[PDB]
Amino acid sequence: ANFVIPYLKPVADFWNSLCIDQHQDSLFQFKGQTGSLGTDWTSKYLRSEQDVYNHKYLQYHKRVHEAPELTDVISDNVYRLTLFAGVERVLSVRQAQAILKTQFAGATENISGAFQTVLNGGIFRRGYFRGALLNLLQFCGAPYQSLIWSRNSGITNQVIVSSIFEAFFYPLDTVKTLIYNDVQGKYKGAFHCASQVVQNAGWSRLYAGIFQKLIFNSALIFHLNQVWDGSSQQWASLALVAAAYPLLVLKTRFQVAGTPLALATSNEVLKVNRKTLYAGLVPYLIFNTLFAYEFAAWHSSTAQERVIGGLQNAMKQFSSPAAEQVWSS
Amino acid sequence: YNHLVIKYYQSFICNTLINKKKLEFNYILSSFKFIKELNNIIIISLNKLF
Amino acid sequence: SRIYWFDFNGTVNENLPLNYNVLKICRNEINKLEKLNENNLGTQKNPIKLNLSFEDKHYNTNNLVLDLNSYETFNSKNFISSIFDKTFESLNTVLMAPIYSFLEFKLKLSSTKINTNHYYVINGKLYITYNDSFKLFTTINDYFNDLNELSNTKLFFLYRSFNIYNIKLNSLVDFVFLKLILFIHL
Amino acid sequence: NRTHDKVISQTYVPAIANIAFTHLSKKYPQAGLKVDQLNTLKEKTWNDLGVNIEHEKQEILVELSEQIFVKESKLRWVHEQRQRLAHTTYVFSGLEFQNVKVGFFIDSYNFLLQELAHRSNLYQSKDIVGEKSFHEKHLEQQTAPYSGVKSLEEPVSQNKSFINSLMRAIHNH
Amino acid sequence: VAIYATYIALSYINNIWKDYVVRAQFSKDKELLFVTRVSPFGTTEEEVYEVAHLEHLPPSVRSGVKDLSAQDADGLVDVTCMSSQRSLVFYKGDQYWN
Amino acid sequence: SNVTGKVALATLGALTGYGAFYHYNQYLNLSARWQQIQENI
Amino acid sequence: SSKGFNLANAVNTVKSTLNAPIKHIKRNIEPTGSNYS
Amino acid sequence: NYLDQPFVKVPNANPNASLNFEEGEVLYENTRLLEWAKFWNYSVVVGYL
Amino acid sequence: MNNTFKFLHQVISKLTLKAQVPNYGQYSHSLKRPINPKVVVFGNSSRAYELISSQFRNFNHVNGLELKGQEDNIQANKVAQSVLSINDGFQDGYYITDFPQNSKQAERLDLITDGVNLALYIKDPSDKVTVTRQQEAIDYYRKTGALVEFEVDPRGDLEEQVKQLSNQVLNGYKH
Amino acid sequence: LAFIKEANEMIQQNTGNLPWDGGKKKIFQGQANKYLETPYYLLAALSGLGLLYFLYSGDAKYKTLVLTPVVGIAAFVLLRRNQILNRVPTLTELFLHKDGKFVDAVVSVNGQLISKNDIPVSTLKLYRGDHTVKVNLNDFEDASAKKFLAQQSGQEGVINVHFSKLRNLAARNGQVLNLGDTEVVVPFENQANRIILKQIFKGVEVLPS
Amino acid sequence: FTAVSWFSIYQFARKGAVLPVLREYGRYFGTHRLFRQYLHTLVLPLLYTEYALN
Ligand SMILES: CCCCCCCCCCCCCCCCCC(=O)OC[C@H](COP(=O)([O-])OCC(O)COP(=O)([O-])OC[C@@H](COC(=O)CCCCCCCCCCCCCCCCC)OC(=O)CCCCCCCCCCCCCCCCC)OC(=O)CCCCCCCCCCCCCCCCC
Ligand SMILES: CCCCCCCCCCCCCCCCCC(=O)OC[C@H](COP(=O)([O-])OCC(O)COP(=O)([O-])OC[C@@H](COC(=O)CCCCCCCCCCCCCCCCC)OC(=O)CCCCCCCCCCCCCCCCC)OC(=O)CCCCCCCCCCCCCCCCC
Ligand SMILES: CCCCCCCCCCCCCCCCCC(=O)OC[C@H](COP(=O)([O-])OCC(O)COP(=O)([O-])OC[C@@H](COC(=O)CCCCCCCCCCCCCCCCC)OC(=O)CCCCCCCCCCCCCCCCC)OC(=O)CCCCCCCCCCCCCCCCC
């Protein structure tokens, strides 16, 4: 009561908040009336039952008709960044595995080998979560800045704005790629990795693969809009990004080339065996399909109609199935 | 005492290597005065107390 | 082009398997004996004569000028002006990637593994093509075992090449425990 | 007063004492340091013998590393000696053996030698092959090639059919 | 119930794992056998046995020989310490044997 | 650590430079909106 | 681009997993030298 | 009182001086049992909890 | 060192050893083989040749008998250059025969090549030249602890001897 | 193929069998040890400021009053120890001239490369044991420091200190080499040509080429 | 069922194991056994489904 419960209460309270409706609990905490009907527990429960869908609509409306918020965007993409952060690294390792030394370090040239190589260092800074903060920072960069400057905009404008910001923040992406593929702990951190690159090669070394990253980004944005709209042509766009996938693979190899982490140089990367261009294509598509970015600010009119229509259909459940049709209401 | 000797030994090696002829006393006596005074006053206080 | 005979004037010990370099020389000479035509050389009565020195049989190669832990240097090739060519070539590779896969699949349909021959009999012993030389062949199981060992060596090379002297933590643990025991003795 | 605990191997203890006494005898000829007196010398302190082991500690370590050969280590002799020398000097730099008995110095050096040998063997018997781990078996299984269908590769007119060609390409790629 | 249920579970789990042998080392004169066994939390625990006491005993029922794990090439060998009334279990696989 | 300092300083300047541009644009838009609100009131 | 999953390998592993506890089950239920009459 | 048997001495608490406890050579070694024991023991505890 | 602290010391050491060689407990069997296995073989019997050929299928032969007559320094240097490289076939294992013939050559080779990973001696009763030629080398490798002895009976089982020899050399390998 | 080339280069470097790189041949390759000092300095400053704030405010606990001085002292001691370790002259590379009588070396001091040339092989000497370092107290310009050193040493103005007391923080990770008039630390973890390295350390001169 | 059977047939065929069902080669067009096993696996369950439903 004086040495355990005070420290254990926050844990239980946090546990309950996740497992209980905060809005519904807040309504029930206030009991009585001030002169207006509908404050009783029965009426509050009925309201709270529909408040789940109302709050979802309000949150969706805020993300579209109000300035984007970093916390809201991160919350929507929490799984892609919080729990499955290491999935990005293994995908990066698989893409660059063609010109890496992993195959000589108890690993195979497949997604299973890439997973083992990442997990051989554990789960923390040298393992699964290596580069996770850089992934979070990169997400807080161009993907979030682009939303601010392209809220409620067309596909073409979104691609242009995203391309501009990705170029602006590109050096961060190169550093993250080097950290992901740094399997021997050569680099002690992002600043250390950047310092080594600048000291050995020029500042231009950080912008390797930019023009092949921009083109792939444009294809990804087009695919993202198609799936958000829900049109039948989403599968056709999914093929388009799959066809453009080797652009991403080349980008990763160029970033990872010209450094002790790789066995090849920039010139040799271009003339790499063509049978490994589609390295990790299926894992990449699966990960994106399950964890596609939930950028509601870029949703078009059709996507907004789809979401509202879905909420409205759910809202219809609050009628009595056996309601009598009376001549007089 | 050991730290001062090592610092003096290191400074002597560096100055001979670089041909400076001047010892970096600013580094050798990094905190000698503070440490010596702190120990001395503590010992004096303990002797007076006990 | 399967049976050939080589004669060494005591320069090669046949009581033990031939070296990789020796086999490479044999393959390099057979490839000439076939493509360049043949004067009936390579039979038991008219074998191929070779005088192999210690350097040829043992020394691997030359041109060991690779610089370990090095970075490619930019800002000298005018990356700003030269990036256009790389981007165009990369776009060409991506566009042609599906086409190359389709072409390769067609080649597989019209091609068979048995079409090419890789077995050569040398000095009454069977050998199979290996990278750029020959490899002794005695049984299918033995060949698969050799491939497994080769794959194992390639796979675990980096793990076996660990740092012997990276024992900072181990020394610290030993020092702490002994010092504690030293205090007990004192 | 005597427990059921395995004692550290004493194979190299006589050699360590012999080397240490010989070097110390080069500087203290009248110290009476002999291998035959190890059972009794180990009970005395260096102060009683009038020997300042601190000054000669580094020389003893260098001579021990160069002289002693350990066959239980998984590393070659040159690497084993270098690692042993680096390990012992670091550990003994912060240890003062002057005020303790000779046996502690000898036992301490023997303990370091054995631990280095065990660490060289990854804390496993050098004479036991052992069983491959899950990763080793998994990698070996994956490393194995695929035989495919030999019937399709058999040279026959029927194998020239487009359908048979398609099956051969799909299954023997 | 909570205190004794936990105690019984942990104590009996240890007894089940006690028979199996993790490591076995002879003495210099091959007069004693030092055996490392599983501890309650899965760590190493040391014990000492005499080679003379150790003995491989046949089953009391003579029809149960075919049911012994030793029938399999990769089975388990049950060696009994006749002084301490303890059992030592060794894998038959030669990989684990010197 | 001169290279590291330059890289860190360059990164701070670039991020700070973007921050100034973002706030300046936001300042203009807010000023225009505030003027329109005052006229409407 | 090494090949990954193979059903035949998976089936073999499943067989090994199911056969792993057979030796221990036999030892537990087998008779012992003692005859507690 | 119980240790003071009338006709036979109880064994000495310390091992006989004849025995030498110097380590020899390893006969049997199955280190993976420790990992198996830890896995099973923790699994049952979590399941029991 | 101390009975009470042995358990704690062993546990801490095992945890820390992972830093030097990660996942050593999972890849312990693989690590028994060195990166560049250099083997010195003593034995000139017909059975010994068969065992050598079977055990060293993927290794490269180095005939040191051709170097007889030259000075030890040159012989050691030539052998080191032979066994300090990897061919295009990725065969990093070399086994030497008829060398070294004396301690001086043996020590010189070890210094140049940082020691030989293995020194295999196949004691065949039907061999009478190996002892007369390379007795000094055998003694040196016995002193340095790199010598592995595997007695072979000519009338034994070839398969069993190969299996035992493979296990012993794998155990006897050193980094 | 690329890995094989790198693996061969790694093997050559480890064995120290490099060829003649022009006018001089590299026969030694070592690296120094770097320790963290800024984190300890920041931690010590934070503890010092925190202790001052607690005294000024008076709202601290007994627990933190006990802990803060210990953390500050521990950080301060580590900072001094790391600074001494970092500033240890450590031999990084050593080259031998064609004639075999002259040696060039580059040394690292707190990450700073210093190149020394024209070092006769006859002057090189590796200290197997603990040498003695001479300290001249007359050089010190501080009366208090001079008095303290004399009292501790118990000797004249020139005091000889055995290296055993100093190897804890001076050469704990290596030996001591005499590069003519100066002395440098030779780490154990290094790649070098043992045949040539031993002779030059002993003072013997190798044959030309 | 068709997807699982097709996956199983391909995986074992890759390893060199083919179920000894159906003639190895066709009587008229010489189609290989693997091709007909895929055809039978695709069509037979569909016919059974239609027969079962009717
Ligand atoms: C959760 C509640 C709160 C939520 C808040 C809302 C969320 C959003 C908040 C965002 C804002 C946060 C506050 C500000 C943070 C600022 C950070 C910062 O600045 O860091 C910089 C970052 C720091 O440098 P660094 O430390 O060396 O690099 C990072 C290391 O790699 C290390 O990175 P890593 O990825 O390898 O890390 C692995 C990861 C391993 O561990 C994990 O990943 C664990 C994950 C577990 C699962 C997650 C479960 C949910 C979360 C649990 C939270 C529990 C509490 C944790 C407590 C942590 C301690 C505070 O952790 C580590 O090991 C980190 C190492 C420790 C040192 C560094 C970090 C210190 C701690 C700071 C933490 C801040 C996080 C706040 C947000 C919350 C995140 C959760 O540096 C850079 O980004 C440098 C980039 C340079 C790029 C190249 C530049 C080139 C030149 C450019 C030129 C441009 C001009 C060109 C002109 C061209 C012409 C036009
Ligand atoms: C529940 C079970 C599964 C759960 C998974 C775990 C989930 C946990 C939660 C999430 C976190 C984990 C995230 C994922 C982790 C990674 C998982 C993993 O290991 O997966 C990889 C693993 C393979 O990895 P691996 O073993 O390392 O790869 C082997 C080699 O490395 C080869 O790999 P590579 O990287 O080197 O790739 C080279 C590429 C090389 O190939 C090429 O690139 C070929 C290129 C050909 C070019 C020809 C050009 C001809 C000319 C053009 C003609 C057309 C255009 C003409 C245009 C004209 C007008 C303009 O190879 C391939 O294409 C073959 C890749 C494997 C194909 C797998 C197919 C799975 C199908 C599943 C069943 C069917 C769907 C059922 C749907 C309904 C289900 C209820 O994948 C699988 O075995 C399957 C995974 C599960 C499949 C999920 C279903 C797909 C979902 C997304 C797509 C939806 C369909 C869209 C189209 C249709 C719409 C109607
Ligand atoms: C019906 C409608 C369905 C519609 C959907 C249909 C979709 C179909 C898709 C296509 C699927 C094709 C089939 C094959 C697919 C295979 C998968 C594949 O392609 O993978 C490629 C690759 C293949 O592996 P490989 O190494 O290349 O080669 C495999 C060997 O050849 C293989 O040989 P091996 O020797 O290695 O064998 C492996 C395994 C082969 O067998 C299998 O693995 C098959 C397993 C089948 C069952 C699966 C059920 C669960 C499925 C997942 C459910 C969730 C999916 C969600 C989907 C997304 C939904 C949005 O062998 C065994 O059987 C081992 C024995 C153990 C088996 C399991 C035992 C279960 C016992 C249960 C009873 C327990 C006792 C209860 C009673 C006691 C009281 C409690 O696999 C992977 O690498 C998979 C990667 C998956 C990663 C997932 C994400 C991980 C994220 C980690 C996060 C960590 C965070 C930590 C945080 C820490 C913070 C502190």
Ligand SMILES: CCCCCCCCCCCCCCCCCC(=O)OC[C@H](COP(=O)([O-])OCC(O)COP(=O)([O-])OC[C@@H](COC(=O)CCCCCCCCCCCCCCCCC)OC(=O)CCCCCCCCCCCCCCCCC)OC(=O)CCCCCCCCCCCCCCCCC
């Ligand atoms: C792990 C906890 C272990 C607790 C042991 C308890 C012993 C009970 C014995 C029973 C026999 C009868 C004795 C009389 C009745 C006892 C009544 C009683 O229990 O009163 C407790 C008394 C009740 O306080 P309260 O009425 O709630 O007042 C609240 C104020 O905040 C309170 O603030 P305040 O400043 O006014 O506090 C007054 C301070 C005034 O102090 C005194 O009571 C008198 C002076 C005693 C000397 C120690 C003072 C604390 C200095 C720091 C630790 C130094 C290391 C040596 C510790 C020796 C054991 C005390 O009294 C204490 O709290 C003394 C204990 C504090 C120790 C904190 C560090 C925990 C680890 C300790 C063991 C370390 C291993 C040592 C190995 C052997 C070494 C030879 O204080 C406690 O609550 C103590 C327990 C607090 C546990 C939570 C700590 C914070 C959260 C975790 C932080 C972890 C990281 C930082 C610490 C890391 C380790 C250094």
Ligand SMILES: CCCCCCCCCCCCCCCCCC(=O)OC[C@H](COP(=O)([O-])OCC(O)COP(=O)([O-])OC[C@@H](COC(=O)CCCCCCCCCCCCCCCCC)OC(=O)CCCCCCCCCCCCCCCCC)OC(=O)CCCCCCCCCCCCCCCCC
């Ligand atoms: C309603 C339609 C539904 C259609 C469903 C789709 C599947 C069936 C049609 C598929 C067609 C496209 C397939 C791809 C073609 C690719 C090209 C290619 O290379 O061929 C692939 C492959 C043949 O390639 P191959 O390399 O030459 O392989 C030959 C191997 O010998 C072949 O060996 P095997 O390994 O295939 O095994 C033999 C075959 C078993 O086949 C037999 O040989 C069994 C024969 C049983 C005869 C039962 C007595 C019938 C009494 C008279 C019936 C009159 C019609 C009554 C109409 C009632 C109203 C519906 O399979 C089995 O034994 C296992 C299956 C178990 C039996 C289930 C059969 C169900 C059939 C359902 C459809 C029936 C359509 C009839 C159309 C009208 C016929 C007049 O095609 C097939 O396997 C398809 C076979 C379809 C049935 C053929 C029946 C022939 C005997 C006719 C007797 C009566 C007329 C005789 C006239 C004589 C001249 C004057």
Ligand SMILES: CCCCCCCCCCCCCCCCCC(=O)OC[C@H](COP(=O)([O-])OCC[N+](C)(C)C)OC(=O)CCCCCCCCCCCCCCCCC
């Ligand atoms: C291995 C260790 C090696 C180093 C050895 C170090 C030797 C010196 C040890 C010094 C110990 C000091 C203990 C201080 C205890 C806390 C005092 C305190 O809280 O005062 C804050 C007070 C009040 O400050 P405040 O007004 O800000 O109040 C803050 C309130 N608390 C403490 C709850 C946060 O400040 C003072 O003015 C104190 C001045 C005196 C400080 C010394 C007091 C010593 C009391 C214990 C010993 C008593 C004598 C014992 C018998 C000996 C013979 C007489």
